[PDB]
Design a protein around this ligand. Structure first.
Ligand SMILES: N[C@@H](CCC(=O)N[C@@H](CS)C(=O)NCC(=O)O)C(=O)O
Ligand SMILES: N[C@@H](CCC(=O)N[C@@H](CS)C(=O)NCC(=O)O)C(=O)O
Lengths: 237, 239
């Protein structure tokens, strides 16, 4: 049984209470919702271990999405941050502004999106797990994961040093590849990993360029505040 | 840094390495979809993924990678990361959405189960193999935790395949690029390598056999094992 306040009249983005370490994945779909101006609700999950939530996301994490299918026949779900970006782009990015307009654009977008999904994303998550959450400290494992993060920054830096390559996938504009990468490739996160972000200057310039976008600013503000307003958990007003 | 003499792009070129039990579980993924769709393609066996010319194709310096002609045939494009090679082949060659998804509903579940593999089981399996075989020092506590995380991913797949009529991971009716991406890390041989009893996940085992019975999957496994063991060891294989 779902909570009484969980209804799907539009896209519902599932998040947790905003903290330094709880927002770096949930901010990704929120950035794209803000960029495209998609109507949406915010549901603050008290416990991702709740049986009702595992029916939405079997991996028992945020972000997750419930939405009405375009024909209204089904309730659709998206879970895994990369999948939430793919879903929003499919349903709402009509012109492929962030999803890609043609096979050539999508070939590069999917390369840099998947690189984050498979390499930096999971490496960063395992680094955080062993550094903070694992009952035993395994410094040899932590150091190897930190080393792997620097290799991923090296790859992103190489790409952004190519002539006229202002963004990761396309030269001209940011895509879901850029949105997926940003939260794990910015000064604050680099400092958490114990890295000097200035040692990747084109990657830092790129992170500031993305950070100056109004949709990205709004997304970061809102994800920090969720659960700290008038309502702590459930459907926000 | 100059491309080898025998590297030309007159059609889709799939970059692989010499076939072994632990060198084919990512390269087999695009090869399965190519065989399912009957896409014309060449095979290029890379001797050293560390070679500068190869890093210009895949900056992550791994297989699989693809070079192909653009739709209009005037330009060359690239796909790298196994999940990206599946998304590209589906975009360029699966116009009926048989494996890529025909509508927003289908693609929502395809992308959920494809991304779950790309983010969770795939990278966890890769880290497991790295610490087990490749890392200069054995870290058994790390290896054990990664092995435990694999069993959690198996539990999720088992739950999905226990749902009424859910014959495949994403769609009830047919396999998709989600199923193709998952199969190589969710079959008896790979489970045995991880030191797991695959029988503990009966619906997952039944699914792996159902996928394995497909003629395109049989052709992919037989071919990927042989790359680099034929009359030509490295470079562009003769079709
Ligand atoms: N692979 C997932 C990871 C998401 C993730 O790590 N979410 C955290 C943010 S706090 C979570 O749900 N953790 C809550 C918990 O398990 O306590 C993605 O990229 O979406
Ligand atoms: N995340 C990548 C991983 C691919 C991967 O692990 N590739 C290995 C398989 S052998 C590789 O290229 N190794 C080169 C070598 O050492 O021969 C994907 O899913 O495509």
């Amino acid at each position: 049984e779902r909570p009484s306040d969980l209804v799907v009249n539009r896209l519902v983005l599932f998040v947790v209470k905003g903290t330094a370490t709880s927002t770096h994945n949930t901010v990704k779909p929120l950035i794209l919702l803000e960029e495209l101006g998609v109507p949406h609700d915010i549901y603050v999950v008290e416990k991702v271990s709740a049986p009702w939530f595992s029916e939405i996301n079997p991996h028992k994490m945020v972000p997750a999405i419930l939405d009405r299918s375009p024909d209204g026949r089904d309730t659709l779900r998206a879970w895994e941050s990369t999948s939430t970006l793919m879903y929003i782009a499919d349903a709402y990015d009509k012109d492929g502004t962030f999803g890609g307009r043609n096979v050539q654009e999508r070939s590069e977008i999917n390369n840099w999106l998947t690189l984050h999904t498979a390499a930096l994303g999971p490496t960063a998550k395992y680094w955080l797990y062993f550094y903070k959450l694992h009952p035993e400290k395994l410094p040899k494992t932590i150091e190897k994961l930190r080393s792997n993060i620097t290799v991923q920054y090296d790859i992103l830096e190489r790409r952004l040093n190519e002539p006229g390559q202002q963004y990761l996938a396309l030269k001209d504009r940011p895509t879901i590849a850029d949105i997926a990468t940003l939260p794990f490739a910015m000064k604050s996160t680099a400092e958490l990993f114990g890295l000097e972000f200035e040692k990747w200057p084109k990657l830092q310039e790129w992170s500031v360029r993305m950070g100056e976008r109004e949709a990205v600013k709004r997304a970061w503000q809102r994800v920090a505040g969720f659960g700290h307003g008038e309502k702590e958990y459930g459907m926000l007003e």
